[PDB]
A and B are shown apart, each in its own frame.
With several copies, the nearest count.
Chain A
Amino acid sequence: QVSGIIGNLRHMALDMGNEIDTQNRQIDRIMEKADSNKTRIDEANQRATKMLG
Chain B
Amino acid sequence: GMDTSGKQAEAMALLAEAERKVKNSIEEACEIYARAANMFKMAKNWSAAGNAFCQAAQLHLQLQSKHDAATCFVDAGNAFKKADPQEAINCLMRAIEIYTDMGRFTIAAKHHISIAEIYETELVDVEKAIAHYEQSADYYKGEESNSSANKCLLKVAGYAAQLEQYQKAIDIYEQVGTSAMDSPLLKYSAKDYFFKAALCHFCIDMLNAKLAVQKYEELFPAFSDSRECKLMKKLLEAHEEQNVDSYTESVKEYDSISRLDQWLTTMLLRIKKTIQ
Interface residues of A (CB under 8 A from B): 12, 15, 35-36, 39, 43
Q: Is B1 in the interface zone, CB < 8 Å from A?
A: no
A15 with B67: CB separation less than 8 A: no
What's the least CB distance linking A1 to chain B, in Å?
10
- In the complex, which residues 61-101 of chain B have their Cβ closer than 8 Å to any Cβ of chain A? 65-67, 71
Specify the main secondary structure of chain A where it touches its partner: helix
Q: Is B185 in the interface zone, CB < 8 Å from A?
A: yes
**CA distance in complex: A28, B107 (Å):** 11
A39 with B67: CB separation less than 8 A: yes
B65 with A43: CB separation less than 8 A: yes
Residue of B nearest to A38 (CB): B67
B184 with A36: CB separation less than 8 A: no
B185 with A36: CB separation less than 8 A: no
A15 CB contact (under 8 Å) in B66, B71, B107, B184: B184
What's the least CB distance linking A27 to chain B, in Å?
14
Q: How many residues on the B side are at the interface (Cβ–Cβ under 8 A)?
A: 8
Chain A residues with CB under 8 A of B185: 15
Chain A residues with CB under 8 A of B188: 12
Known: A15-B184, A15-B185. 4 other contacts (CB 8 A): A35-B67, A36-B67, A36-B71, A39-B66
**CA distance in complex: A12, B184 (Å):** 10
Chain A residues with CB under 8 A of B67: 35-36, 39
Residue of B nearest to A5 (CB): B225
What's the least CB distance linking A8 to chain B, in Å?
9
What's the least CB distance linking A2 to chain B, in Å?
13
A-B contact pairs, 10 of them (CB 8 A): A12-B188, A15-B184, A15-B185, A35-B67, A35-B107, A36-B67, A36-B71, A39-B66, A39-B67, A43-B65
Chain A residues with CB under 8 A of B184: 15
Chain B residues with CB under 8 A of A15: 184-185
Chain A residues with CB under 8 A of B66: 39
**CA distance in complex: A39, B98 (Å):** 14
What's the least CB distance linking A53 to chain B, in Å?
14
Residue of A nearest to B102 (CB): A39
Chain B residues with CB under 8 A of A36: 67, 71
What's the least CB distance linking A39 to chain B, in Å?
4
**CA distance in complex: A43, B71 (Å):** 15
- In the complex, which residues 83-139 of chain B have their Cβ closer than 8 Å to any Cβ of chain A? 107
Q: Nearest 8 pairs between A and B by C-beta?
A: A39-B67, A15-B185, A36-B67, A15-B184, A36-B71, A43-B65, A35-B67, A12-B188
- Which of B65, B67, B71, B188 gathers most chain A CB within 10 Å? B67
Chain B residues with CB under 8 A of A43: 65
What's the least CB distance linking B220 to chain A, in Å?
15
